């Protein structure tokens, strides 16, 4: 007669006494129990095929992905505590800088720079949301999926600030076209086509290993360095102290994403040939990333530099992983 | 050996019951009763167990054997009480 | 100052664009989107009734967990679980094993819509939907975790869905069919409209009440808390059915609702039915599973469908009829096959309960009551072995549940067999078979447990082997919840 | 990035300056500061052991209330109060009436130090101390408020301290003497060191346990929550005693501790004593009021005093001795004078309880047991009227509580009378009288209840008039908690 | 036999169904039950006299002060929710502006202006803390006392930011004397003696009515307009965006204090002669207030103006009350 | 009329008992017993109630009256059982 265990049976016998994180995020996916028939239905359904091919057949291999652990050990309970605080800080900025008339102090030039370079980001950001949410549903382990979950929420969050600030800006400069003109800018402005291609294409890289690399290793670093880093510093020097602080607030999220993206790569390197697998994918997308940074940053004042810093800063993200 | 689905009379659930291709209907019902009589259904002495094909209702003779009934493996049979 | 949500909400879901570096179909694969020939513009009419934004979310949900986790800590040392009615402990052990991981799995279902839905409103709501199920998966693992030291059965809160125990298979059969293997539009109808808005929502309300009534506040808090989140994401299906009906596909929509409701009902008649009418103490039941279904579930489906411009499913009258039979059978089945589940089935057929049953179900004692009579004598007369089985029941191929119905004086147990491509299939009802026939490629080569037994896939090929095949061992194999206490009343 | 609290804390309490537009004495009036000839520099050595800063406070305390208020809401509809042991309901009704407003009053006591203490560390800690009692006053009003519809007795959670019911007077007598009419330094010793660190702290721990044991989690949560705050402000007295001993006044310090402890003990022997040994169900008592006092209260006082370099009070041996008698008398008094309090006193003298009592107190049945015998016969023999009084007891002039002690075979009831300036005073013990004598101007013209009765200040001058004078009316006037159920065991 | 009531008996019979605020903050003081002998001891104790004289004999009279209601209806539970959010915003600013190196961007001039005009405020602020905490213990009604409670906490809060920021500044400019030189500045700097006198004196106005006026009606408005308003705008224009935002964050608290201070005055005017009582007190202290604003603001660049704006802004606070 | 504090023997609490200046000690004890005997103290027939001043122990004669005892208003008296 099986006597009661000290913890879950799949964690039984390590003996640093599991953590809430481990207790609630490990070995949860079940479609990975039968690689031949992942779902409890006919093995030929399109969804069976899609998983057999994009999760199981991925060249990025590891004997046991469930071993993965989020370095920040995020859990739904602690994600909301972390972010509820961060939102308090941010909604704070919005509320008070407004009370101060911050938007009225911006020059006509800068207001136009915002309609061009800032606000249309609601698209690129939502695109990332979509991107990180695809990783969530095709990754081979609940702990990898979870990192993807919170990161997707973070994206919707960046999208929400932008949406918010767009209306605030529109109320202050009703003739600029804020909120009404972004789709055309996202779709026709040369400065944006670089990023739009990178993301539209990356969005159809279905292999989980490649989706992860395409989105978290190449695209995001480049989006983060171009839109948060570069535009932020510009904003700061242009008197837009809000966007400068806002962009910084979001960079915090970007960093948590990099943190777990690294942990994953560190793990993937524990096995032969993956570094090569990861580098062929990066080699494939890096070119589209440089094209995005060149189209965007070159249109910003002090262009060539923004292009040089974003280029090496985002490269540095991967270099530090190997 | 041949599997069939037993849907005993007055019982509540059809069950898996392995019979033999050589068994007469009488013996098939014997094997089915074992899983229903004195478990969920009261015995009925002054009665006789007959076997009918559940799908169409064909009633097999007590003496007929499995080989001659043209059954599909796993075929569902009603085991009813008759005179 | 701050803006009024009214003022900027729309911008948060003005995120569609005309792709050009890839084609629309490439970006939104039909097998994943299910846009069904309807355009982006058309899908952009999608307007979720219940709106929420990120800040409001992290804030509100932060408070929800504070409360739940606070309560749990406060009542932890009270060890209520140790002195709670065994039927209740069973109820919980059943709940967590069949729901915790499927809750977590729903997170992916929501992810499906978040990425593949063409209606931008649907994509964001699904992102919060994604978050919600994440909470449900975690919190509903965290809570039972407090009892792993009490009985291995609590380990199944995590283990269950990872096994081939017949109930787990029936669960995966349902969830994989409804939310894991469907296109985005489909998921929103079959999962959020049909299943969540249709069943689990009202159910959780009662389960939270039931818990309260059992003196289990930790669980009452847990459930009703989870329940408050259901609203925000269960909506998603409605706007989808609307767009489908307002455009060509009213039939396609109808068909999914039809399947989604039946399959839901079946799972519901073995996981909820048996609990209300038999595990809950007689003194703690304010209505029969049938009364519950009629008042809280059926009425609402009709209003819902009527407002969407759809029709009641073709099987509706059978459905209402079956409210008098099905769960009794599922309960008798589960109890009789006691050792095959991971919790202790509550017989629930003592003199008083039997009166109640007869009152809530006129004719119960003449039909269902009889099997139980025989089970009781054998128990009274010291023949327990005749109350456990020596063979497997016939599993339906659609719902993967035993095929059972009315016994006794009005014996009416049927099997809707179907020969398809050289293989004979067994179905527990007209509708279950029809689910197979309107889409055979979806279920064709799947094999239920009997199928595997009969194929030699279970070895040794006997009951001991089947138990091992289902990961059951003494300690978690179920037996009579009240330990046959109800017997000594017949002597 | 953020700084380490270690790094900037001191600056938050580097707030003393040399006044010049007003004199130091004007700014820090002696009657309010009690700096006692010790200098600012000297007082600036004051270093609170437990440090906290504003952000940490609003954050931590925010979470504390979320939990408490969450729990209360969750268990509200459960109406546990309606099926809880009457001795428990009494316990609570007693708690709220005597504590809610005095808790709120402590907010002012803390304000005294916050403005008048010369040690900057003391001023800030007192500001958080001020906030803490604000919570206690409010939350401990909010909670009982949930039962006003159940019995007027719950209205006394607010009303009590506003009346002249004898218990309320004894309460104000204590609190006004210890924290409302003392200089800053004095308050920190008599209130936070003597009373809070000395009694209420450990007490609340047990009360929270008691609650838990009674199945009252709302109250268990409430109490232990409040309790966690006690630490942060109860410290304040220690550093003050240190500075006083390290400078001239070791005697002044000793004297206050002496008074503060005795007066605390007395209040404690009628509000806590009777509850543990008599209202708590026999099956739910893990130790006698005496055992509690010895293990959790007395030992700690000695370690405390020893470390501060002080001595045990001159009355210490009497004190330990009195642990065997005093609360039994306070309990018999309160029960006998049943209708004069606002809750239902639990007799607590059934066969089994009487055995327990005899075990925890060898000789109880031969002394205290006898009065109860007589009370019981009269009850058995249908003479209830002989169990309520027709006159007032003799109230002590220091603690405003009846003067009672050992009856039975070892009758030893004494009265430490004292004629002072043409008026005769009555004291319940050696120490109570000594509190008067070391500082007569402080208590001289105060009049206890008997004094007022005898002066014609109560009209009509009879029991009915005294009840009206104390705002008592049928509905809140107390009677036997278990309704004499314990009687039918003697027949 | 008295049957159960719908609410507390002292609130029984109004019938807008009391609020949590009312349920937990009304009619709590008991020393006001016997004006002859407020405390349960000898009626001649010094504490009895102190109350008989400073609370009871105050010329600022009203038949029933317990009627008072805080316009913000603050309660301990909601005070911490309000402020925990506000602290999240502020600790946020501190944390991130720091990450940004904000303090390093300040000029040498401004750093010295801070050591002179900013940091020594830990004294003036703590003084207010002391001031509002005296009002708390001598006011004639628990609801008045409560407003005083939270306001005292607010003061300790301002004192805490200052203490915090002083150490941050000291770590960045260790040679300036931050944290070490403020007492001398508070005690000897001409720019400070104005305020120091006002507060040292106001701190011994024991009559509750006068303490309230001296502290909440005259001193605070002047401290708030000189140290938060004036120094804030200066900071903002001097590149110190942190102090500019911080000062604004605190002004929020100042405003809540003004809000209830008004409600009290509105109430006090319901009865003859109080307006005159209140004006004679203001007339007495206004002079010391102008002296404080003149000593402080005149030492700030653009002195005379700061003096003119703070002077009329703080006056406006009282003018709007009557 | 004159008030005194009764500290009855074997009882547990001293009580307020109004007596008359004309009452003999015997009658004072009568008035005190009323508040103690058959309430908390068993009667003792073969005994006699005597009155002594609690402070010093002075024992008053059964026949002495209140006026002649030199009592302070509210003075505490012991009512003890003697022969
Ligand atoms: Fe869920
Ligand atoms: Fe859900
Ligand atoms: Fe307290
Ligand atoms: Fe306290």
DSSP C212-258: HHTT-HHHHHHHHHHHHHHHHHHTTHHHHHHHHHHSS-SHHHHHHHH
Using a CB-CB cut-off of 8 Å, the residues of chain A touching E100 are 248
The C-alpha of C155 sits at a distance from chain A's nearest C-alpha, in angstroms, of: 6
Shortest CA distance from A246: residue in chain E:
E96
C460 prior amide bond cis, ω within 30: yes
Pair D71, C71: CB distance under 8 Å: yes
Q: Look at residues C405, C450, C396 and name the one whose alpha carbon lies nearest to residue C427.
A: C396
- C425: Cβ contacts below 8 Å, ≥ 6 apart: C397, C417, C418, C419, C433, C436
**Is the Cβ of D403 closer than 8 Å to some Cβ of chain F?**
yes
Considering only residues 43 to 82 of chain A, which have any Cβ-Cβ distance to chain C shorter than 8 Å?
A: 43-48, 50, 75-77, 79-81
CA atoms within 13 A on the CB side of D76: 13
The answer to whether the CB of E1 falls within 8 A of the CB of D479 is no
Nearest to F3 among D333, D378, D454 (CB): D454
Closest chain D residue to the Cα of E157, Cα to Cα: D54
Q: Do C374 and B41 touch (CB under 8 A)?
A: yes
DSSP B28-80: HHHHHHTTTBTTTB---TT-EEEEEETTT-PEEPTT-BGGGGTPPTT-EEEEE
CA quadruple E238, E240, E245, E246: dihedral, nearest 10: -120
Q: Which of B13, A2, A7 is nearest to C477 (CA)?
A: A2
Q: How much distance in Å is there from the Cα of D102 to the middle of ligand 3? A: 9
Distance, CA of E43 to chain centre = 33
How far are the Cα atoms of B33, C2, C64, C78, D78 from residue C223, in angstroms, in the given order? 45, 34, 12, 19, 16
Is D12 touching E (CB cutoff 8 A)? yes
Chain C nearest CA to D152, separation (Å): 28
CB contact under 8 A, A93 and E89: yes
- C181: contact with A, CB 8 A cutoff: yes
Experimental method: X-ray
F42–D387 CB contact, under 8 Å: no
Pairing of strands F59-60, F76-82: unpaired
Nearest to E186 among D17, D111, D443 (CB): D17
Q: What is the 3-state secondary structure (H, E, C) of C414-443?
A: CCCCEEECCEEECCCCHHHHHHHHCCHHHC
- Chain C residues with CB inside 8 Å of B39's CB? 374-375, 378, 386-387
Domains annotated on chain A, with CATH: 1-322 (1.10.620.20)
Is D355 annotated as belonging to a binding site? no
Contact D200, D230 (CB under 8 A): yes
Q: Which of A34, A1, A3, A18 is nearest to C161 (CA)?
A: A34
Mind telling me how many Å the CA of B18 is from chain C's nearest CA?
A: 9
- The tokens describing A126, both together, are 């939502």
Q: What's phi and psi for A149, nearest 5 deg?
A: -60, -60
Write down which chains contact chain E via at least 3 CB pairs under 8 A.
A, D
Rounded Cα gap, residues B13 and B2, in angstroms? 20
Cβ count within 10 A of residue D376: 21
Distance CA E64, CA E42 (A): 26
Chain A residues close to C160, C-beta within 8 Å: none
Helices (H), E173-240: 182-188, 190-202, 208-212, 220-223, 231-237
Which backbone phi and psi does F53 adopt, to 5 degrees? -70, 120
Q: What single string gives the DSSP state of each residue in C56-79? A: HHHHHHHHHHHHHHHHHHHHHTT-
Provide the 10 A C-beta neighbour count for residue D412: 10
CB contact under 8 A, B39 and C392: no
Count CB neighbours of E66 within 10 A.
Answer: 18
Q: How far apart are the first and last CA of chain B?
A: 29
Q: Do F12 and D407 touch (CB under 8 A)?
A: yes
Tell me the CB-side half-sphere exposure of residue C141, using CA atoms within 13 A. Answer: 30
Tell me how far apart the 2 most distant CA atoms of chain F are, in Å.
32
Largest distance between two CA atoms of chain D: 80
From CA E41, how far away is CA A88, in angstroms rounded? 50
Q: What is the DSSP letter of C84?
A: S
**What is the domain partition of chain B in residue ranges?**
1-83
Can you give the three-state secondary structure of F2-17, one letter per residue? EEEEEEECCCCECEEE
Is the bond preceding residue C63 a cis peptide, omega within 30 degrees?
no
Contacts of D36 (CB under 8 A, 6+ apart): D30, D185, D244, D249, D252
Q: Does D491 touch chain E (CB under 8 A)?
A: no
β-strand partners of F4: F17
At residue C173, what are phi and psi to the nearest 5 degrees? Answer: -60, -45
Closest CA to C404 of C372, C374, C427: C427
Helix H segments across C381-491?
A: 430-437, 449-454, 463-469
User: Any residues with CB less than 8 A from the CB of E276 and at least 6 apart, and which?
Assistant: none
CA dist A8 and A23 (Å) reads 7
**Residue A155 near residue A125 (C-beta atoms within 8 A):** yes
Q: Minimal Cα–Cα distance from D53 to chain C, Å?
A: 23
Partner-chain contact C413 B11, CB within 8 Å: yes
Q: Is residue D48 annotated as involved in ligand binding?
A: no
Q: How many CA atoms lie within 13 A of D94 on its CB side?
A: 27
Three-class HEC string of chain A: CCCCCCCCCCCCCCCCCCCHHHHHHCCCCCCCCCCCCCCCCCCCCHHHHHHHHHHHCCCCCCCCHHHCCCCCCCCHHHHHHHHHHHHHHHHHHHHHHHHCCHHHHCCHHHHHHHHHHHCCHHHHHHHHHHHHHHHHHHCCCHHHHHHHHHHHHHHHHHHHHHHHHHHHHHHHCCCCCCCCCHHHHHHHCHHHHHHHHHHHHHCCCCCHHHHHHHHHHHHHHHHHHHHHHHHHHHHHHCCCHHHHHHHHHHHHHHHHHHHHHHHHHHHHCCCCCHHHHHHHHHHHHHHHHHHHHHHHHCCCCCHHHHHHHHHHHHHHHHHCCC
Interface size, chain C vs chain D, as Cβ–Cβ contacts under 8 Å: 33
- The span from the CA of D311 to the CA of D258, in Å, is 9
C-beta neighbour count of D228 within 10 angstroms: 15
CB atoms within 10 A of CB E103: 18
Of C201, C347, C171, whose CA–CA distance to C266 is shortest? C171
Q: Resolution for this model in angstroms, one decimal place?
A: 2.9
Q: D95 labelled as ligand-binding?
A: no
Both tokens of B53, joined, read 């094909």
Q: How far apart are CA F6 and CA D393, in angstroms?
A: 9
Residue E265 token pair: 């005055």
Nearest residue to D117 via CA among D50, D178, D176, D43: D43
Do C272 and C444 meet the contact criterion of CB atoms below 8 Å apart? no
Give which of A57, A79, A88, A124 is closest to A260, Cα–Cα: A79
Place of tokens 């890839």: C22
**Dihedral of CA D455/D460/D461/D464: which sign?**
negative
Token pair in block for residue C187: 């998921």
Q: Is the Cβ–Cβ distance between C152 and C475 less than 8 Å? A: yes
Q: What sign does the CA torsion over C452, C458, C461, C462 have?
A: negative
In chain F, breaks (C-N over 2.5 A) are found after: none
- For residue E269, how many other CB atoms are within 10 A of its CB? 14
Contacts of A92 in chain E (CB under 8 A): 85-86, 88-90, 92
C-alpha Rg value of chain D to the nearest Å: 23
Q: Do the beta carbons of residue F80 and residue F52 sit within 8 Å?
A: yes
| Helix locations, D438-480, DSSP H | 449-454, 463-469
Token pair for residue E74? 């603050």
H helix and E strand count, chain C: 24, 2
* D389 and D478 Cβ atoms separated by less than 8 Å: no
Residues 6+ apart with CB under 8 A from D362: none
Tell whether C63 is in a known binding site.
no
Kindly report the backbone phi and psi dihedral angles of residue D374, in degrees, each rounded to the nearest multiple of 5, phi listed first: -60, -40
- CA separation for the pair D218, D80 (Å, rounded): 9
Q: Helical H runs in D275-416? A: 289-292, 299-308, 316-322, 326-336, 351-360, 368-380
Backbone φ and ψ of D112, nearest 5°: -55, -50
Question: Does D295 show up as a binding residue in the annotation?
Answer: no
Residues of chain B neighbouring C394 (CB-CB closer than 8 A): 5, 13-16, 76
- CB-count burial class (<10 Å; 0-12, 13-18, 19+) for C226: buried
Helix H segments across E31-107? 46-51, 76-99
Other beta carbons less than 10 A from residue E303's beta carbon: 14
CA distances from E21 to C165, D139, D142 (A): 56, 11, 10
Beta-ladder partners of F80: F50
Q: Do D374 and F35 touch (CB under 8 A)?
A: no
Is A80's CB within 8 Å of C7's CB?
Answer: no
Q: Where are the beta strands (DSSP E) in D85-136?
A: none
Q: How far is the CA of C95 from the centre of ligand 1 (A)?
A: 13
From CA D214, how far away is CA D284, in angstroms rounded? Answer: 8
| Dist CA C228 CA C230 (whole Å) | 6
CA of D137 to the centre of ligand 4 (A): 10
DSSP symbols for D399-429: T-SB-B---GGG-------EEETTEEE--SS
- Angle formed at CA B11 by CA B10 and CA B17, multiple of 5 degrees: 125
- In this complex, do E85 and A89 lie within 8 Å of one another by their Cβ atoms? no
Report how far residue D222's alpha carbon sits from residue D72's, in angstroms, rounded to the nearest whole number.
8
Name which of C66, C71, C77 is nearest D74 (Cβ-Cβ): C71
Selecting from C17, C150, C476 the residue whose C-beta is nearest the C-beta of A2 gives C476
Inspect the interface and report whether the beta carbons of D66 and C63 lie closer than 8 Å. Answer: yes
Cβ–Cβ contact D203 with C under 8 A: no
Residue contact E9–D155, C-beta within 8 A: yes
Nearest-5° angle of CA A92, CA A93, CA A96? 80
The reply to whether residue B12 touches residue C374, judged by beta carbons under 8 angstroms, is no
- Rounded to the nearest angstrom, the gap between the alpha carbon of residue D235 and the centroid of all alpha carbons in its chain is 18
CA C406 centroid distance within chain? 23
Q: Do A88 and E93 touch (CB under 8 A)?
A: no
For C394, the closest of B15, B55, B73 (CB atoms) is B15
Number of C-beta neighbours around residue F43 at 10 A: 10
Per the CB < 8 Å rule, is F5 touching D394? Answer: yes
Whether the CB-CB separation of D366 and D374 falls below 8 Å is answered with no
Ligand 4 centroid to Cα of residue D217, in Å, is: 22
In whole angstroms, give the CA distance from residue C282 to residue C278: 8
Residue C467 sits at φ, ψ, to 5 deg, of -65, -40
Taking the centre of ligand 2 as the mean of its atom positions, its distance from the CA of residue D66, in whole angstroms, is 26
Question: Rounded distance, CA E212 to CA E193, Å?
Answer: 22
Query: What is the four-CA torsion angle of C192, C197, C203, C204, rounded to 10 degrees?
Result: 70
| Interchain proximity C71–D66, CB inside 8 Å | no
D233: annotated binding-site residue? yes
Q: How many whole angstroms separate alpha carbon A215 and alpha carbon A221? A: 9
Interfacial E residues in 95-124 facing A (CB < 8 Å): 96-97, 99-100
Q: Are A59 and A276 in contact (CB under 8 A)?
A: no
Cβ within 8 Å of residue C29, ≥6 positions away = C116
Pick among 3.40.640.10, 3.40.50.720, 3.10.129.10, 3.10.20.270: CATH of B1-83: 3.10.20.270
**Cα–ligand 4 centroid distance for D324 (angstroms):** 28
Which residue, C61, C51, C58, is CA-closest to A90? C58
Beta-carbon separation of A160 and C181 below 8 A: no
Whether chain C has a CB inside 8 Å of the CB on D294: the answer is no
Candidates 1.10.620.20, 3.30.210.10, 2.40.30.20, 1.10.274.10; CATH matching C1-491? 1.10.620.20
Closest by Cα among C199, C236, C14 to C112: C236
Interface of D with F in 441-470 (CB under 8 A): 450, 453-454
CB C388 within 8 A of CB C339: yes
Residue C248, CA distances (Å) to A40, C36, C254 in order = 31, 9, 12
Residues forming beta bridges with residue C423, ordered by sequence position: C420
**Partner residues linked to C420 by β-bridges:** C423
Buried b (16+ CB within 10 A) or exposed e, A178-187: bbeebbebbb
Per-position DSSP letters for E286-316, written without gaps between them: HHHHHHHHHHHHTTSTTHHHHHHHHHHHHHH
- The SS3 of residue D34 is coil
Report how far ligand 3's centroid is from the alpha carbon of D179 (Å).
Answer: 12
* A254 CA to centre of ligand 1 in angstroms: 28
Alpha carbon B40 to its chain's center: 16
């Amino acid at each position: 007669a099986l006597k009661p265990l000290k913890t879950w049976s799949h964690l039984a016998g390590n003996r640093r006494r599991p953590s809430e994180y481990e207790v609630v995020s490990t070995n949860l996916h079940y479609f990975t129990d039968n690689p031949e028939r992942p779902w409890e239905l006919d093995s030929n359904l399109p969804m069976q095929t899609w998983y057999k091919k994009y999760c199981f057949d991925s060249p990025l291999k590891h004997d046991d992905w469930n071993a993965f652990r989020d370095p920040d050990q995020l859990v739904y309970r602690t994600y909301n505590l972390l972010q509820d605080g961060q939102e308090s800080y941010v909604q704070g900025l919005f509320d008070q800088l407004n009370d101060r008339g911050h938007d009225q102090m911006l020059t006509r030039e800068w207001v136009e720079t915002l309609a061009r370079f800032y606000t249309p980001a609601r698209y690129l950001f939502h695109a990332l949301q979509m991107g990180s949410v695809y990783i969530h549903q095709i990754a081979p382990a609940s702990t990898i999926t979870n990192c993807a979950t919170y990161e997707t929420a973070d994206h919707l969050r960046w999208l929400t600030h932008t949406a918010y600030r767009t209306r605030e800006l529109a109320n202050c400069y009703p003739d600029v076209g804020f909120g009404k003109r972004e789709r055309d800018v996202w779709e026709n402005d040369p400065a944006w086509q670089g990023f739009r291609e990178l993301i539209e294409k990356a969005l159809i890289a279905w292999d989980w290993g490649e989706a992860f690399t395409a989105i978290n290793l190449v695209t995001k670093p480049a989006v983060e360095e171009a839109l948060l880093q570069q535009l932020g510093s510009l904003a700061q020097s242009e008197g837009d102290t809000l966007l400068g602080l806002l962009a910084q607030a979001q960079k915090r999220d970007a960093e948590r994403h990099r943190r777990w993206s690294s942990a994953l790569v560190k793990m993937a390197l524990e096995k032969e040939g993956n570094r090569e697998v990861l580098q062929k994918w990066v080699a494939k997308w890096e070119p589209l990333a440089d094209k995005a940074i060149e189209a965007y940053c070159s249109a910003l004042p002090d262009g060539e530099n923004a292009i040089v810093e974003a280029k090496s800063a985002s490269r540095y993200v991967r270099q530090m992983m190997g | 050996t041949f599997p069939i689905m037993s849907n005993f009379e007055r019982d509540f659930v059809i069950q898996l019951v392995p019979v033999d291709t050589e068994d007469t209907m009488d013996q098939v019902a014997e094997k089915c009763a074992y899983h229903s009589i004195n478990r969920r259904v009261h015995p009925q002495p002054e009665k006789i167990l007959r076997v009918r094909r559940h799908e169409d209702g064909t009633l097999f003779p007590r003496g007929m054997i499995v080989s001659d009934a043209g059954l599909r493996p796993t075929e569902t049979l009603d085991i009813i009480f008759m005179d | 100052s701050m803006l009024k949500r009214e003022d900027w909400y729309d911008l948060t879901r003005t995120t569609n664009w005309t792709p050009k570096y890839v084609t629309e179909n490439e970006l939104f694969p039909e097998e994943m989107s299910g846009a069904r020939g309807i355009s982006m513009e058309a899908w952009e009419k999608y307007d979720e009734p219940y709106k929420i934004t990120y800040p409001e979310y992290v804030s509100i949900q932060r408070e929800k967990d504070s409360g739940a986790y606070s309560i749990k800590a406060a009542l932890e040392r009270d060890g209520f679980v140790d002195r709670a009615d065994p039927g209740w402990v069973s109820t919980m052990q059943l709940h967590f094993g069949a729901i915790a991981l499927e809750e977590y799995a729903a997170s992916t279902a929501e992810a499906r819509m978040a990425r593949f839905a063409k209606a931008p409103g649907n994509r964001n709501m699904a992102t919060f939907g994604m978050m919600d199920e994440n909470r449900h998966g975690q919190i509903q693992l965290y809570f039972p975790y407090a009892n792993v030291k009490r009985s291995r059965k609590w380990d199944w809160a995590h283990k269950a869905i990872h096994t081939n125990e017949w109930a787990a298979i029936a669960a995966r059969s349902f969830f994989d069919d409804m939310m894991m293997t469907r296109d985005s539009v489909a998921v929103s109808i079959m999962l959020t409209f049909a299943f969540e808005t249709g069943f689990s929502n009202m159910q959780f309300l009662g389960l939270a009440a039931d818990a309260a009534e059992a003196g289990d506040h930790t669980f009452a808090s847990l459930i009703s808390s989870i329940q408050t989140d259901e609203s925000r994401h269960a909506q998603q299906g409605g706007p989808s059915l609307k767009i489908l009906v307002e455009n060509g596909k009213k039939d396609e929509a109808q068909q999914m609702v039809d399947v989604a409701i039946w399959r839901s009902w079946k799972l519901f008649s073995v996981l909820t039915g048996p609990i209300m009418d038999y595990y809950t103490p007689l003194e703690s039941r304010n209505q029969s599973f049938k009364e519950f279904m009629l008042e809280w579930i059926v009425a609402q489906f009709e209003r819902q469908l009527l407002d969407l411009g759809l029709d009641k499913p073709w099987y509706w009258d059978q459905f209402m009829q079956d409210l008098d039979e099905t769960h009794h059978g599922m309960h008798l089945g589960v109890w009789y096959w006691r050792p095959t589940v991971w919790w202790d089935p509550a017989a629930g057929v003592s003199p008083e309960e039997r009166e109640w049953l007869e009152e809530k179900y006129p004719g119960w004692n003449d039909t269902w009551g009889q099997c139980w009579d025989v089970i009781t004598d054998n128990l009274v007369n010291g023949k327990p072995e005749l109350t456990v089985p020596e063979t497997l029941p016939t599993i339906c191929n659609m719902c993967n549940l035993p095929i059972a119905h009315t016994p006794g004086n009005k014996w009416n147990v049927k099997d809707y067999q179907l020969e398809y491509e050289g293989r004979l299939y067994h179905f527990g009802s007209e509708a279950d078979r029809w689910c197979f026939q309107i889409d055979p490629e979806r279920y064709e080569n799947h094999t239920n447990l009997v199928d595997r037994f009969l194929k030699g896939e279970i070895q040794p090929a006997d009951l001991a082997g089947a138990l091992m095949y289902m990961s059951l061992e003494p300690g978690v194999m179920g037996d009579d919840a009240h330990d046959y206490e109800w017997v000594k009343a017949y002597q």
